[PDB]
Amino acid sequence: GYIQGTHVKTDLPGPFHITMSPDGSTLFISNQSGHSVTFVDARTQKVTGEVAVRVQPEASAVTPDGAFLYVCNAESDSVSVVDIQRKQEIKEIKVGDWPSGIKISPDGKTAYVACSGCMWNAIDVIDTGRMEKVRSIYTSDYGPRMVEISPDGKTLVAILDTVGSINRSVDFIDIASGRVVENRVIHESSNLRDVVYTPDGKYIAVTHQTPKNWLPVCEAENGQVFTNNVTIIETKAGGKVARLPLDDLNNYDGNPYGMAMDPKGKYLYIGVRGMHRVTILDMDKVLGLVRSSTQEELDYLRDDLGLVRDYLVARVPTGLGPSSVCLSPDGKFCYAANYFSNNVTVIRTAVD
Amino acid sequence: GQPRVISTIQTGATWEPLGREEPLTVPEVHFRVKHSPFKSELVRYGQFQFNDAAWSLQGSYSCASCHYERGQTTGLIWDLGDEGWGSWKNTKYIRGGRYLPPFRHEGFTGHPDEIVGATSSLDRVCGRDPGFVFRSENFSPMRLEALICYIRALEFTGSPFRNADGSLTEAQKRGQKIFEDPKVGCLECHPGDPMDPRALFSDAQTHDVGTGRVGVNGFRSTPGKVFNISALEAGEDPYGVESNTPIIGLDLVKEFDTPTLRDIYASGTYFHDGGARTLMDTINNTVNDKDMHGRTSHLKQQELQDLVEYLKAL
Amino acid sequence: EPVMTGGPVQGKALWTDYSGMSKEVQGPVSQILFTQSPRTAKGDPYQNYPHYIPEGSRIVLFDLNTKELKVLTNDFATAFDPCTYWDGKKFAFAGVHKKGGGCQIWEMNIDGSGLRQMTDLKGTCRSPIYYAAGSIEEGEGRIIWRDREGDWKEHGMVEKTGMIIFSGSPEGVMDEFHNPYAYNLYRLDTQGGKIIQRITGHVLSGIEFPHLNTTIDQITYNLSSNFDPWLTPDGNILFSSVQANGSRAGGEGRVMICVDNWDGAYPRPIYGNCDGEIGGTSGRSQAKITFGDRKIVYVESPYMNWGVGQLAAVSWDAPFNKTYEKLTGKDGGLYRSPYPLPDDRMLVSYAERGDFGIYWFNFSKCAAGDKVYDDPNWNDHQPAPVYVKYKPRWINTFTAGKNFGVTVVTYQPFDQVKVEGYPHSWGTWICFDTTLSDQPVGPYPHQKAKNVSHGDIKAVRIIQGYQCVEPDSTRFRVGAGAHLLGGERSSSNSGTAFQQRGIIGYQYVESDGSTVTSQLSDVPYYMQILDDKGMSVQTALTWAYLRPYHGRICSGCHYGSYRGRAFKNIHAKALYNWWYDDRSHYDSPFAFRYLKFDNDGNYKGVKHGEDVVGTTSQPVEGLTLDKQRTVDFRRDIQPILDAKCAMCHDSNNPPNLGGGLELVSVDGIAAYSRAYNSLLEPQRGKDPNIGGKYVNPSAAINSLLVWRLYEAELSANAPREKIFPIEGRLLHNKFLTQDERYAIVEWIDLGAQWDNIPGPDFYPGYLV
Numbered sequence A: 001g002y003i004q005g006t007h008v009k010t011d012l013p014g015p016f017h018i019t020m021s022p023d024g025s026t027l028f029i030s031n032q033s034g035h036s037v038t039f040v041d042a043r044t045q046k047v048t049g050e051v052a053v054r055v056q057p058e059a060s061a062v063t064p065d066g067a068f069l070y071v072c073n074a075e076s077d078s079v080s081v082v083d084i085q086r087k088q089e090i091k092e093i094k095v096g097d098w099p100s101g102i103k104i105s106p107d108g109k110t111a112y113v114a115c116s117g118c119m120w121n122a123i124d125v126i127d128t129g130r131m132e133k134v135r136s137i138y139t140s141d142y143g144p145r146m147v148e149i150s151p152d153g154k155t156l157v158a159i160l161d162t163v164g165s166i167n168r169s170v171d172f173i174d175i176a177s178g179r180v181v182e183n184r185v186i187h188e189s190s191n192l193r194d195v196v197y198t199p200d201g202k203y204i205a206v207t208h209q210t211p212k213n214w215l216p217v218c219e220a221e222n223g224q225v226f227t228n229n230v231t232i233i234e235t236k237a238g239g240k241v242a243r244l245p246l247d248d249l250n251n252y253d254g255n256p257y258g259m260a261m262d263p264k265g266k267y268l269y270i271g272v273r274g275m276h277r278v279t280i281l282d283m284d285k286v287l288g289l290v291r292s293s294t295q296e297e298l299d300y301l302r303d304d305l306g307l308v309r310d311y312l313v314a315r316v317p318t319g320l321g322p323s324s325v326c327l328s329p330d331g332k333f334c335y336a337a338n339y340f341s342n343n344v345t346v347i348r349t350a351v352d
Numbered sequence B: 001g002q003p004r005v006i007s008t009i010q011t012g013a014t015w016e017p018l019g020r021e022e023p024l025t026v027p028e029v030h031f032r033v034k035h036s037p038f039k040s041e042l043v044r045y046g047q048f049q050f051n052d053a054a055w056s057l058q059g060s061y062s063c064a065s066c067h068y069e070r071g072q073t074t075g076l077i078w079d080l081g082d083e084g085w086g087s088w089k090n091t092k093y094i095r096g097g098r099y100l101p102p103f104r105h106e107g108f109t110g111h112p113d114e115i116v117g118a119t120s121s122l123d124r125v126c127g128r129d130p131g132f133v134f135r136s137e138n139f140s141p142m143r144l145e146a147l148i149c150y151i152r153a154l155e156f157t158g159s160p161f162r163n164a165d166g167s168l169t170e171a172q173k174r175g176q177k178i179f180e181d182p183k184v185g186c187l188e189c190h191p192g193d194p195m196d197p198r199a200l201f202s203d204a205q206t207h208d209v210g211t212g213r214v215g216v217n218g219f220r221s222t223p224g225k226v227f228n229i230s231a232l233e234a235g236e237d238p239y240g241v242e243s244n245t246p247i248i249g250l251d252l253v254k255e256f257d258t259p260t261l262r263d264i265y266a267s268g269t270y271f272h273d274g275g276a277r278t279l280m281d282t283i284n285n286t287v288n289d290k291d292m293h294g295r296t297s298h299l300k301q302q303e304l305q306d307l308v309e310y311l312k313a314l
Numbered sequence C: 001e002p003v004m005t006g007g008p009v010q011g012k013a014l015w016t017d018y019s020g021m022s023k024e025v026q027g028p029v030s031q032i033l034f035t036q037s038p039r040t041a042k043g044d045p046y047q048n049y050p051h052y053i054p055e056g057s058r059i060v061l062f063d064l065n066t067k068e069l070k071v072l073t074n075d076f077a078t079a080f081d082p083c084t085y086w087d088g089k090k091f092a093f094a095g096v097h098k099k100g101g102g103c104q105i106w107e108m109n110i111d112g113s114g115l116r117q118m119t120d121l122k123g124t125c126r127s128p129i130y131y132a133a134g135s136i137e138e139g140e141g142r143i144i145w146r147d148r149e150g151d152w153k154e155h156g157m158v159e160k161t162g163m164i165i166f167s168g169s170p171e172g173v174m175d176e177f178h179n180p181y182a183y184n185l186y187r188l189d190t191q192g193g194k195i196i197q198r199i200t201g202h203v204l205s206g207i208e209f210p211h212l213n214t215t216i217d218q219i220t221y222n223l224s225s226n227f228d229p230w231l232t233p234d235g236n237i238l239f240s241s242v243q244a245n246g247s248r249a250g251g252e253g254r255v256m257i258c259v260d261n262w263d264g265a266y267p268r269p270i271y272g273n274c275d276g277e278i279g280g281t282s283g284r285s286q287a288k289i290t291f292g293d294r295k296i297v298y299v300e301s302p303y304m305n306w307g308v309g310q311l312a313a314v315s316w317d318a319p320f321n322k323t324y325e326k327l328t329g330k331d332g333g334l335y336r337s338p339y340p341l342p343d344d345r346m347l348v349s350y351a352e353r354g355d356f357g358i359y360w361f362n363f364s365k366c367a368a369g370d371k372v373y374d375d376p377n378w379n380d381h382q383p384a385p386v387y388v389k390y391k392p393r394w395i396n397t398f399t400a401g402k403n404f405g406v407t408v409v410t411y412q413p414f415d416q417v418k419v420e421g422y423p424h425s426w427g428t429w430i431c432f433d434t435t436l437s438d439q440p441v442g443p444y445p446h447q448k449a450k451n452v453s454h455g456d457i458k459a460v461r462i463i464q465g466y467q468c469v470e471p472d473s474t475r476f477r478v479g480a481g482a483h484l485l486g487g488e489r490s491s492s493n494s495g496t497a498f499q500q501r502g503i504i505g506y507q508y509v510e511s512d513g514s515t516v517t518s519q520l521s522d523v524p525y526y527m528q529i530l531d532d533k534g535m536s537v538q539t540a541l542t543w544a545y546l547r548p549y550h551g552r553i554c555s556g557c558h559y560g561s562y563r564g565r566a567f568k569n570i571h572a573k574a575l576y577n578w579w580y581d582d583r584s585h586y587d588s589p590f591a592f593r594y595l596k597f598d599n600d601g602n603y604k605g606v607k608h609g610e611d612v613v614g615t616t617s618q619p620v621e622g623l624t625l626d627k628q629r630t631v632d633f634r635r636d637i638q639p640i641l642d643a644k645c646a647m648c649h650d651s652n653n654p655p656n657l658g659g660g661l662e663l664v665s666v667d668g669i670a671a672y673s674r675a676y677n678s679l680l681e682p683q684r685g686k687d688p689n690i691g692g693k694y695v696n697p698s699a700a701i702n703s704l705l706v707w708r709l710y711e712a713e714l715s716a717n718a719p720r721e722k723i724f725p726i727e728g729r730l731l732h733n734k735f736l737t738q739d740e741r742y743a744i745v746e747w748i749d750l751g752a753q754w755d756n757i758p759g760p761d762f763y764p765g766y767l768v
C-alpha cells in the first residue's frame, strides 16, 4: 500500500477510521495505507479478516441490520459496498471528490456521502436497494468533511471545512426536502474534523481549532497561535453557538479529530490526534454550562484556560495518531484507531 | 468508575517513531544548504513528525494544523516574524514541492540570505520552524531529514474538473486558447501542457507581477494601502477582524517566486499574501497592478470565466 | 509510563513527554544529598529568605541502606543548596570556602572529588540548577558560524555540559523593602562562552570569569528578589518573584510563583500575584513540580521572608484557585524544601517540635511519613536524592547576552552598542488593546480611575525604576515618612512606598487602542495608559524588562493574555508600525521625551527631546542614561509652589506650602519641607495606599490637588465627601501654566517622591 499523497510503498495498514455494528459484535477499521478494511470481533478482540476495497479508504458506515458496510474510498473518488458475512466487496459506486465520510439513514434505505474536495461542495445520496447514487445535495460552501443524521432522521448536518476561510460553517439539510434550510457559522474556526448529535437531538458537537491569524507569530504560550476547541450548537431555531476550550493553560489537545457520543448523552469522547490521547468530557456539565450562560458569557468563556477542568472527566493515553473513535451500544467501551501505531486502543468508560 | 485502558488490539505491524537524539543548532540548520539524497524509508517517520503535536512546547498545534494532513494547505494566512510585521503570507501548498526550487514565496530579489526568501533547501524551511514558529525544541538531523523526505515525496492530486474520459471539456479547451495566447502571455512565466504529467506551469524564477504590497507613501512606508479595489469600493474595513483575507499589507520585497499552477483548484486564496480570494481575482486586475500579471484588460467576462475553468483543469 | 501524552507502546512514554520519561529513566534511589545547618538564628537564617547564608552549614551524602553518612564539604566554611546533575554523578551548590572569596557557585563530583568554582562575583550567589542547552546527549557538539557575505562553516568543538541558572545579588544595594539585598536570575556558560557560541555563533556577553573559564549573563531585571529557580516540564525556568512595586497589594506586595525563559525573554505569572487568589501575603518559596499528577508544590510561609512553613500545591497545567490545595496541612510542625520524585514519592524536611529532619511524605495522611535521617544537633533540610534526571527541552535564544541580539533573518549575533553605535541596548513592545482589561473601576492605582474606550486613551507613559543605592549612611534614613502615606516603607527619598523613578518616555496610542514602541533594554520598567489630559487612568505595577533586540507582545492591559486567558484575535494598527523596512531591525518609534498640549491643556501630540542620536528608520531617542528625565520635588515642584502658591498658603490657610526647602522635624526626623509634608498628609477614613488628603500616589487623576488645579471632576473616585467649598470658593485653574501643572501631574503619577536623584546629592535632605 501507498502512503497518502505519495508513490512510496508501505506494508502498514495505517488505520484512519473506526466504527461498530449496531449489535456491537464487530469493529470495522478503514486502513488508509492498506487500501482495505479490517474486521475485528468485539468479544475476542481478534482479527477475523481483511476485506479489500479501492484506494485510500477514509470512512465507513454500517447498515442498521449489519449485513453491509459502505466504505469511503477517497483517492478512488468512490464508495465500496461490502458484504459483511461474505467478507467481499459486491459493488463500487462513483461519487464526487474525496468522500471523507458516509452515514446510513435510520430506516437504512439511504446513505449520505460527504465529498470533501477543496473545490467540491456536495453530499451525494445513495439508495441502498438500487445500490446507486441518486442525486447530489449542494452545500453552502466548499469541503464538507463529514455529515451526521438526527435521531428522528428528518435532518442532516454537514460540517463545511473550507480552505482559506476563517469563518467555517455547518449546513442544516431537510432530508425529505433535500435542500439547505439554514447555515450556521462558527467564528474563528479551522480544521473541522467531526460532527455528532446528542441522543435527544437538541445539540451537535463539532471539534475544531481556533487560529489567531491577525496576530504576530511570537510565542507558543496562552494559545497565541492555535487553541483547540469543541463547539456545541443548539439545534433549535436561533439556538446558541457555544465555542468551548479543550485546553489547559500549559496543556493543550493538539488537533482534535474523532468524536463518539454516549448513547444516553452522558459523556463526549474526543480523539486527540496530535497529543495521542482520548479526551472524555461530562456532557451534562457542558450542556448545563450552555443552558445557564448567555452568548456573550460563552464567547468570553471560550478563552478561559481553566474552564475545561469543570467539565473534564479524563484524558486517556492512546497509541500514536488516534484519528477516530467509536462506542459500544451499551457505552461501556470506547475504541480509538491509531494510524502510526497501527492499532486500536480499548478503553473502559465511566459507565457501569 | 474511572476511565482506563484495559487492552490494545494490534491489527497491523508494530511501528515506532524516531528518537529524540541531539537537537540541531540554528547555525547547523542553516548549514544545510542543499537537499540530502532522498530516502524512501524515512518518509513515514517524516509524516509522523509532520502530524505530531507532542514535540511542540505545550502541544498547541502541528505542521498539519497549517499545511493540513493530506499535505496540501488550510488556506490560513499568517504573519511570520522573519519577513517583517504587517507582511502577510498565505500558507504554502506543499504538494509537488521538490519540483520547483527555490522555496517559500519571496524570491532572489532582496534575499542574499537564501533562507527566508529564495530558500535553497526544504531543510531551511521546516528546520527553522521549531525556533521561528513553534517556539519549541529544534529537530535532530535524522528527524529533519525524514521530514524533508516526506515533503519531497508529496505528489500532485490532479484536477477533478476534467472528463472521466480523461480529456478536457470545451469550456476548458476554450480557456486554453486564452491562456496560451501570446498577447495574454501566461505561458511566459507559466510554461506547461495539460496532458503532460511533467508540466510544472512555472518558470521557477522571480518576477514583478505588481502584487507587492506597499504603504500609502510607497515602498518601505507606513501604513499600508488597500490593494483590493473591489473591497475598497465595497467599503470593507482595512483593519477588520472578520475578513478571510487581508486587504492591506506592507511587503519587504516587490518580487516573488512563481508558484505552480498544478492543483491550483485546491489552494485556498491565491498569490503570496492571499490577496486573491478567487481564481478570477488573479486575472481581473483587482488585487494586482494593471496588466502586470498577464495582459487581461482587453478580455471580458466569458473569456475570463473560460480561463478560470482552464485553471481549474490544472 | 505515559503522563502528558500517549507513547509508542502501551505502558510506555514518548520522548516528548517529560514527566513520563522522567518516570522511566529514574531508577532505584539509594543515596541522597542534603544540607545540615547549625541550629541558631545565624546558623539557619530562614527569616532573612531569599537571602540565606546558613553560616556553618555543610552538605552531606547519606545511604538509605548502609546508613553511612559522609561529609563532602569539609573544605568549605559554608555550603548549601545542592542540585544534582543529570547523570547523578556530580552536583552544583552554593557556599563560601575557608580560603574566602564570598558565597559563590561551586560544583563537585558525587564521591567528593573534582571541585570547581563556577562564579567569582561581587555579591552573593545561591541555588544553582543545570539547564541543558544545546546538550541533550553526552559528547562534543560542533561550533558553526557565518563568514561575515560568505558561507556557513565549522569552527571547533565544545564539550556539551549545558548551562547553569542561579539566583544572585550584587553588593551594597537595597530592594523595595530596604533590605540590603536584591536578587536576580543569571545564566552561566560552563564552557566559558563556547556553549552560547555553539548555540548562537558568538560567545556569551555579560561578565566574564576567564580564570574559572565561565561567563554569566543577567536574565531577570526585577528591582526586588527573584529566587529559587527550577525546571518546567516544557523546558522553561520556574521560580519565585517578589512583586513589591510601590503601594501595590495593600502596600505589602506579594511573592508569586512564575516562569521565564532561560534567557529571560518571556516572564509570565503562574500563581499568587493577582487579586482574588489564595495565600495573601504568604511567602512562596522552593517550588517544584510532581511527575505523576503534575502538581506545583511549594513552601507557603506565614511570613513573606520566611523559608519554613506549610506545603501547598496548584496544578501546573491549570494554575488556578480551583486546583489549589493545602498539602500539609495542620499538625503541628513546620515543613521546608520539598522534593517530588518521578515515582510519585516525595522527600520533605519536617520539624515536629522545632527541629528539622529528612522524612518521606505521606499523601494519604497529609503529613510526614517514615523517617529517613535526623541528627538532633543539626537542622536537616534540602533533601536532594541521587537519580537520573531527564533533560527538559532547551528553547532557542535570540540574545547572546548583554548588548547582543540575534537577527531573525540570518540568525547572526550583533552588538547594538560596540558595533551598531547605539548608546544602549534597546528592545520593543506592543499592546494590541490598551483599553482592554479585567480590572474594574476603582480607587486603587492598578485599577481604572474611569471608564475608557477606544480613542479615549491618547498615549502611554513609560517609567524606569531606579535601584536604591545609598553609600553614605548619614544622608539616608528609612522610615522618615512614617507619618505620611508611605508608613514603614517610606524613607528620606520618598514619603510613599514608591522608590526613586524616572520617565523613559511617552508614546502615542492608535485610535483602536493599540500601541507599539522601542525603548531601553535590560532595565526595569512599567507603563501607564493616559487620557486626553495626559493623566494615568491605570497603572501597571510590576517590573517589566526587555532583552536586547527582543519584542514583547500583549493582548491587553492585564487582560489575561499573559495569565489565565488565550490571546484575543485582534487586527491592530500598531502591528504595521512595528517593522516594515528591509534595512531595519525595528521601524517602531522610540519613546518621546515630552508631550505637547493645546490652550486648554488637552493632549495634542508627542514631542521630541534633545537626546536624539542605519539599522532603524526612526530617530533614536532616550537611550542615554545620563540624560534620562525625572521629576524631583526640590528641583522642579517646590520652586513652583514658592512662586505661585506659598504667598497665599500659610499656617492659617491649609495646606501650608510656605517655608521653601527648609526641612521640618517630625518625630525627631528632618527629611522633607513643609509643603511636602502638607501635601503628603493622610486623610481619616482613606487607605494610605490609595492616597492622602491632597495626593494619591501614582494616580494624579484621583488627587484632590489636581482636581482643584483643573477645577473639575476628573475621575469616578471622589477624594472626599466635600471637594469644593460652597462659599469662599476661589478658582485655581488660572494660577499655573500647563507646564507647571502637568509637572505636578507627572510628579504625582511618578509616585510623588521627594528625592528622585539616586544616591547623595547637593539638593536638601536628611543629614546627621
Ligand code: HEC
Residues within 6 Å of the ligand: C641, C644, C645, C646, C647, C648, C649, C654, C655, C694, C704, C705, C708, C723, C725, C728, C729, C730, C731, C732, C735, C736
Ligand atoms: C499654587 C498653584 C496653589 C496651590 C497648589 C493651591 N493653592 Fe489655594 N486656596 C485659596 C483659598 C482662598 C482656598 C479655599 C477656598 C477654595 O478652596 O476655593 C484655597 C484652597 C486650596 C486647596 C484646597 C484645600 C482643601 O480644600 O482642603 C488646595 C489643594 C490649594 N488651595 C492649593 C487661595 C489661594 C491663593 C490666593 C490667596 C493662591 C495664589 C493659591 N491659593 C494658590 C494655590
Ligand code: HEC
Residues within 6 Å of the ligand: B105, B179, B184, B185, B186, B187, B188, B189, B190, B206, B207, B208, B209, B211, B212, B256, B257, B258, B259, B260, B261, B264, B267, B269, B270, B271, B272, B273, B279, B282, B283, B292, B293, B294, B295, B296, B307, B311
Ligand atoms: C510573469 C510576469 C508572469 C506572468 C506573465 C503570469 N504569471 Fe501567474 N504568477 C507569477 C508570479 C510572480 C505569481 C506569484 C505572485 C505573488 O504575489 O505570489 C503568480 C501567481 C499566479 C497564480 C496563483 C499561484 C498561487 O497563488 O500559488 C495563478 C493562478 C496565476 N499566476 C495564473 C496566471 C495566469 C492566468 C496568467 C495569464 C493571465 C499568468 N499567471 C501570467 C508570474 C506570472
Ligand code: HEC
Residues within 6 Å of the ligand: C248, C249, C267, C268, C269, C273, C274, C275, C429, C430, C431, C434, C439, C446, C447, C527, C528, C529, C538, C539, C540, C541, C542, C544, C552, C553, C554, C555, C556, C557, C558, C562, C563
Ligand atoms: C495597562 C496599564 C497595562 C498594560 C498596557 C500592560 N499591563 Fe501588565 N499589568 C497591568 C496591571 C493593572 C497589573 C497588576 C498590577 C498589580 O498591582 O497587581 C499588571 C501586571 C503585570 C505582570 C505581573 C503578573 C500579573 O499581575 O499578571 C506582568 C508579568 C505583566 N503585567 C506583563 C505585561 C505584558 C507582557 C504586557 C504587554 C506589553 C503588559 N503587561 C501590558 C496593566 C497593564
Ligand code: HEC
Residues within 6 Å of the ligand: A217, B050, B061, B062, B063, B064, B065, B066, B067, B078, B080, B083, B089, B090, B091, B092, B093, B094, B097, B102, B103, B104, B105, B106, B116, B122, B125, B126, B127, B129, B130, B133, B147, B151
Ligand atoms: C515542515 C513544515 C512546513 N510547514 Fe510551513 N508555511 C506556512 C506559511 C505562512 C508559509 C509561507 C511562508 C512564506 O511564503 O514566506 C509556509 C511555507 C512552507 C513550505 C514552502 C512550500 C513551497 O512550495 O515553497 C514548506 C515546505 C513548509 N512550509 C513546511 C505556515 C505554517 C504554519 C502556520 C504557523 C505552520 C505550523 C507550518 N507552516 C508548519 C510547517 C512544517 C512543520 C515544521
Ligand SMILES: [Ca+2]
Residues within 6 Å of the ligand: A074, A075, A077, A096, A097, A098, A117, B160
Ligand atoms: Ca478526488
Ligand SMILES: [Ca+2]
Residues within 6 Å of the ligand: B078, B079, B080, B081, B082, B083, B084, B085, B086, B087, B088, B089
Ligand atoms: Ca510577516
Ligand SMILES: [Ca+2]
Residues within 6 Å of the ligand: B100, B101, B102, B103, B104, B204, B257, B258, B259
Ligand atoms: Ca518555488
Ligand SMILES: [Ca+2]
Residues within 6 Å of the ligand: B073, B075, B090, B091, B092, B093, B267, B268, B269, B270, B271, B274
Ligand atoms: Ca494559497
Ligand SMILES: [Ca+2]
Residues within 6 Å of the ligand: C355, C356, C357, C373, C374, C375, C376, C377, C378, C379, C380
Ligand atoms: Ca534534625
Ligand SMILES: [Ca+2]
Residues within 6 Å of the ligand: C755, C756, C757, C758, C759, C760, C761
Ligand atoms: Ca538623592
Ligand SMILES: [Cl-]
Residues within 6 Å of the ligand: C554, C555, C556, C557, C558, C559, C560, C561, C562
Ligand atoms: Cl493581556
Ligand SMILES: [Mg+2]
Residues within 6 Å of the ligand: A218, A219, A220, B135, C261, C265, C266
Ligand atoms: Mg518565547
Ligand SMILES: [Zn+2]
Residues within 6 Å of the ligand: C273, C274, C275, C558
Ligand atoms: Zn495580576
